């Protein structure tokens, strides 16, 4: 059992809400994950879902409080000073349309590092 989060399994089993794979905040999100070390990836997974461990069958079997809830990146119409929002009971992260990769990167890092 490898101690690394399978990011391809994560990406392929992520649904997008009000965004496409071509949306900036999605591309910037995954670039940030690619440059996150293992600690920050786990801190991000627990920030959004409530735990840092993936089910045995991967992200396709991700469960929420009330049943199957795939990991969901949701681009929201919010003020860009907002840090990312997480709803751990259904594994969703709400991200404002940040103006740059740098801003999303710092906001996201602040969210997962200054929580719990």
């Amino acid at each position: 059992a490898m101690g690394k989060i399978d990011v391809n399994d994560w990406k392929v089993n992520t649904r997008l809400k009000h965004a496409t794979p071509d949306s900036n905040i999605v591309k910037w999100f995954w670039k940030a994950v690619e440059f996150f070390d293992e600690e920050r990836r786990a801190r991000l997974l627990q920030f959004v879902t409530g735990s840092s461990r993936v089910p045995l069958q991967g992200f396709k079997a991700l469960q929420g409080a009330a049943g199957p809830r795939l990991f969901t990146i949701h681009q929201i119409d919010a003020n860009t000073n907002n840090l990312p929002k997480a709803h751990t009971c259904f594994n969703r992260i709400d991200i404002p349309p940040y103006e740059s990769y740098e801003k999303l990167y710092e906001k996201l890092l602040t969210a997962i590092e200054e929580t719990s």
Partner: protein, 76 residues
């Protein structure tokens, strides 16, 4: 006067405040220093959550007191 707002990772923020400033006003100063909107801020002093309607004087916060910043980023 001067108060400190300590984050979860120990980062300390120095604010210039006045005992008449409301908690909503103090959060506005935190945003100016940290870019965190007040609705995502929770302030705790002496183990008590500070409500937006009261002032620093209502909670007996004096100069050089330390407040704790908790981020309200997860709804469930």
């Amino acid at each position: 006067m001067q108060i400190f707002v300590k984050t979860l990772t120990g980062k300390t923020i120095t604010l210039e405040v006045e005992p008449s400033d409301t908690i909503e006003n103090v959060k506005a100063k935190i945003q100016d220093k940290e870019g965190i909107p007040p609705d995502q801020q929770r302030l705790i002093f002496a183990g008590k959550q500070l409500e937006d309607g009261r002032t620093l004087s209502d909670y007996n916060i004096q100069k050089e007191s330390t407040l704790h910043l908790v981020l309200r980023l997860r709804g469930c």
